Amino acid sequence: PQDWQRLTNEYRRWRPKKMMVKIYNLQIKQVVTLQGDTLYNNDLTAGVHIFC
Amino acid sequence: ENVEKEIAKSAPFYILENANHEVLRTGEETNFHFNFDCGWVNNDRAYCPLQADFNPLVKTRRYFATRNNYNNSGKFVYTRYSPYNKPSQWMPGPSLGYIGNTQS
Amino acid sequence: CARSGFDKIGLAYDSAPESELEEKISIRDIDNDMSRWGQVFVQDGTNKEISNDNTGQGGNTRQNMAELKNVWMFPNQAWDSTPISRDFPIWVKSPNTDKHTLFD
Amino acid sequence: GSGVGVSTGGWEGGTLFGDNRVITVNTRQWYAPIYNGHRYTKLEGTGNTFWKGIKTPWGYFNFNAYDSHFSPQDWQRLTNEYRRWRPKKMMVKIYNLQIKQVVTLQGDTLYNNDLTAGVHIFCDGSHQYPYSQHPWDAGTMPELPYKVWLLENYGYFQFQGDLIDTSVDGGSPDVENVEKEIAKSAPFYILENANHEVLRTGEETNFHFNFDCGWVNNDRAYCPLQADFNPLVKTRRYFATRNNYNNSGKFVYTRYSPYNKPSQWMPGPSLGYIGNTQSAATREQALGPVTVVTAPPGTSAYTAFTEQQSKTNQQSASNATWSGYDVSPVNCARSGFDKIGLAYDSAPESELEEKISIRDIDNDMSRWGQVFVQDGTNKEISNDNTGQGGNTRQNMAELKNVWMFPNQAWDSTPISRDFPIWVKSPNTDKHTLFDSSDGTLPMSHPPGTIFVKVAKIPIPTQTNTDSYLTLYVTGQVTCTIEWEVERFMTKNWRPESKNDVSSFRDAFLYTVGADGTYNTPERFLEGMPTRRGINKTL
Amino acid sequence: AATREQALGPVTVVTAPPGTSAYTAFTEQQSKTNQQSASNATWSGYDVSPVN
Amino acid sequence: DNTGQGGNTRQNMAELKNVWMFPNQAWDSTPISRDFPIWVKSPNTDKHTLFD
Amino acid sequence: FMTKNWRPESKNDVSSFRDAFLYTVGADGTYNTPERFLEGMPTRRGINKTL
Amino acid sequence: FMTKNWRPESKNDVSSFRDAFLYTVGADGTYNTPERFLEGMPTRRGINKTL
Amino acid sequence: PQDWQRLTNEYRRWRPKKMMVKIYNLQIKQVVTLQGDTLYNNDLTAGVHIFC
Amino acid sequence: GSGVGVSTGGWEGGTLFGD
């Protein structure tokens, strides 16, 4: 909210130049129900598909 | 010859597994760069109507026509605009006066 | 488009995602920019229909002025795009069609 | 070398016609009085108008007209010999400055020259100050090089009287009152914030400018957009015809005539509104084809009510003239209405006679007289099969209002010798196609306005009230514009119509009379308009 | 209509310069300009098709 | 008046037969058959709108 | 922006907001957002543009 | 200034002025000046300073 | 007023660094009363004392 | 150059905001 306020108050116009996105610290968790309870344990060697 | 039969035939179906893309694990990361090509976003306002910007201190050179007798024998009689009312060449921007349906 | 009189009509939106507590619907009321117009009126001639004879007095009454509700694109039009709030979309996908008119 | 007793320059003038360039040098004798008593004051229009603005202790050089730059013959030779022209670069030179003091020693007034008095000269090239100069203003450079030119007082719009009206009382701040806000956010400009020169009699100054602009086309189309084709070949296209006037009907097709062929080229835009002629006695209400009421959403302009459909403040068409500003002419590509929009006088400050000239003559066939649209059969269809016709139906209608549409091509209005050259294009984000029905060339950054005021020399007073010394500035200004031109070439066999004087109705014109009154055209043809004889293959 | 050379088309355009009188023309008394009836205009004018 | 019930009936919706050029319009040109003309002469006029 | 305007421009101050507690969390953690368009700090407020 | 503050600061907008016509000349040329301290745009308004 | 507003809104603190004053375009006028009227005529070779 | 009839300076004004 302040970056917006300071943007609109101090500047005549703006446009984006270039964007950079970074997807990192990935963590893949498995959901298993051992009993009535649900427990969340981390399964290594599971992949995630990412497509731009 | 059935055209609706054809629309359904020529409708696409897309699958994202045709495309080359990354498969990552916990240790891996990825990033993407993009370069915008775009117009601006203007933060400043006009304080004046498009047609109101002129100098009342000078008298205009232009006259406006007036019909006189309301019949076939009539003709336009011309008289000078007021300094405070001057014609303009700048039209209003486009608009559609339809407010949308509120029928409940 | 360029009519600011109707700013209140088109856009109404909520900031709060996934909040069933309250609507909090915000509508764009405030535009002080004078390059956007409230109304446009067109006036096509005298206020009384012309008599077909020479001499004679006026004729049946006639509608001199009218509001133009629908203003399309025309030469020498200049206006300003709507003021945007903090929560708006930045960009929109332009279609991949062959022909495009002015982007506003 | 330099000083009080050597001139800074000399009188330059004339014209140079060339193949690719025309250079018109013009010098005038000008003077600036003390405007408004050296004070900024709120300018309010008398009568009924809501225009409100500032009156400024400044005056300015307005170089925008053709007749100021070209003589009557330079114009004639321009329009006859050249296909198109545009300005390239302008250079103005303000020199031979002389500051005189006005003192009344007795009943008589005597004019004695006070050295060491300055003059402020400011060219706004960035347009940081309101550009209030309008085309079709009477304060441009005189067409007669021997007439002295009184600079015009500068002033600018500030706020709209009926958009500051409601509940603007200053008892307590109303942040939700929008009209209270318009008045708060209205600007106020002072030309003493800007860096500018102060000159004395020995000093001079000059300014250069580089135009970036479109052209001014002097050639006419002899053919309608849709009439250019070869009747010797038969067309391949057929036109549909309904047969039986009922549901069982269908279109039956038959070939166009060789002499009637369809076209892909639409008529250029036009608005069929001729403006209000009601015999209204108020000159300051809006009489114009399109009057535009600018009001922000929350504001109430003059007498306004809420339309209950949209629940927004709106005005009656009669009240809107109070609150709004007309645009004329709107006819654009329709040449049928040429007579409607423009009427103007050449003669400045002459109370002798009106001499109002209206643009009657346009021979250009790329501009259309009327457009008719015809939507189907002349009789309504019966809902049963078989049956005969139905209730009568209106087959054809005139389209009065033609907006912008794909495949439109037209030509701008022919301009006379005395028109404005350019017009300020607004600094708005969005613009459509530039076509001015007054023929002007809109430019993003036109030549920067040159402002002049006379330095304020105080008079000591016991009462300490403001008292200034009464004195004025006279000088010489040389405006030299370089024009980019194109000579025409044609394979046409027949002779073209050249703007001869033989077509003038008045024999003695562009010449002084017995008392020195310079006789000017009262007609549009006598002003030697463009687009006369030079033919343009469509 | 049996006449192939009259204008049958969505938009028929009568090009006449201001002072001219095209075919059978009358003066509209509002603008005092020569105008034509929609039936006569087909004689004097040129259709554009298709306008869709 | 305030309160009250409705009023005279009103036409809510209508077909727009004539759609002129307006901002944010995007469309595609007509499909052409094997036998069409390739090109057309653009007029030598000063002003042109969009070519479709 | 750069301007020769003398008078002060309208800057999107919070003082014009109707709700005092806004853009801040509450007792239960609910982040209070604007329900009005002015409280969303729109553009085109005070910066004047010579026409 | 630089800040990590999330919320918008109070900026000395003119909207808080009580008198609409201010810092501008009148009909007779009288330049209208603030009669109040807020209308004189004081310092130390919105910019927050971590203690 | 706007330079002040933009100053106070956009900046955390300020102080002056260096000032430069320039006194120029000097004009010395004499006040003489030739009659009931007072007339103001410019007398060259009259000095002004300036001391910083 | 210099003398009774040439000005010693000109009107300067405005402001420049910078970082």
Author numbering:
A (entry chain I), I (entry chain B): 105 to 156
B (entry chain I): 209 to 312
C (entry chain I): 365 to 468
D (entry chain A): 34 to 571
E (entry chain G): 313 to 364
F (entry chain G): 417 to 468
G (entry chain I), H (entry chain B): 521 to 571
J (entry chain B): 34 to 52
List passages from the publication reporting this PDB structure.
To expand the structural repertoire of determined capsid structures for the diverse Bocaparvovirus genus, viruses infecting dogs (CnMV), pigs (PBoV1), and rats (RBoV) were selected. The ORFs of these viruses coding for the major capsid protein VP2 were cloned into the pFastBac1 plasmid to enable the production of the virus-like particles (VLPs), using the Bac-to-Bac expression system in insect Sf9 cells. In the icosahedral capsid, the 60 VPs assemble via two-, three-, and fivefold symmetry-related VP interactions, resulting in pores at the fivefold symmetry axes, protrusions surrounding the threefold axes, and depressions at the twofold axes.
Canine Minute Virus (CnMV) was first isolated from German military dogs in 1967 and was initially thought to be non-pathogenic. Later, it was found to be pathogenic in newborn puppies and fetuses, as the virus was found in the lungs and intestines of nursing puppies, leading to lesions, diarrhea, and death. Following cryo-EM data collection, three-dimensional-image reconstruction of the capsids, utilizing 50,866 (CnMV), 98,388 (PBoV1), and 9199 (RBoV) individual capsid images, resulted in a resolution of 2.72, 2.31, and 2.52 Å, respectively. The high resolution of the cryo-EM maps allowed the building of reliable atomic models, starting from amino acids 34, 41, and 42 (VP2 numbering) at the N-terminus for CnMV, PBoV1, and RBoV, respectively. Capsid structures previously determined for the Bocaparvovirus genus showed disperse protrusions surrounding the threefold axis that do not significantly extend radially from the capsid surface. In contrast, the CnMV capsid shows very prominent threefold protrusions, while PBoV1 and RBoV follow the previously described characteristics of the genus. The more prominent threefold protrusions of CnMV are the result of significant insertions into VR-IV (+1 aa vs. BPV, +2 aa vs. PBoV1 and HBoV1, +4 aa vs. RBoV) and VR-VIII (+12 aa vs. PBoV1, +13 aa vs. RBoV, +15 aa vs. BPV, +17 aa vs. HBoV1). The lack of any twofold depression in CnMV is caused by an insertion in VR-III (+2 aa vs. HBoV1, +3 aa vs. PBoV1, + 6 aa vs. RBoV and BPV) and its loop conformation advancing towards the twofold symmetry axis. In contrast to VR-III, CnMV’s VR-I is the shortest loop in comparison to the other bocaviruses (−3 aa vs. BPV, −4 aa vs. HBoV1, −6 aa vs. PBoV1 and RBoV) and is located between the threefold protrusion and the fivefold region. Another feature previously observed for the bocaviruses, with the exception of GBoV1, was the presence of density extending into the interior of the capsid below the fivefold channel. This density was also seen for CnMV, but is absent in the PBoV1 and RBoV capsids.
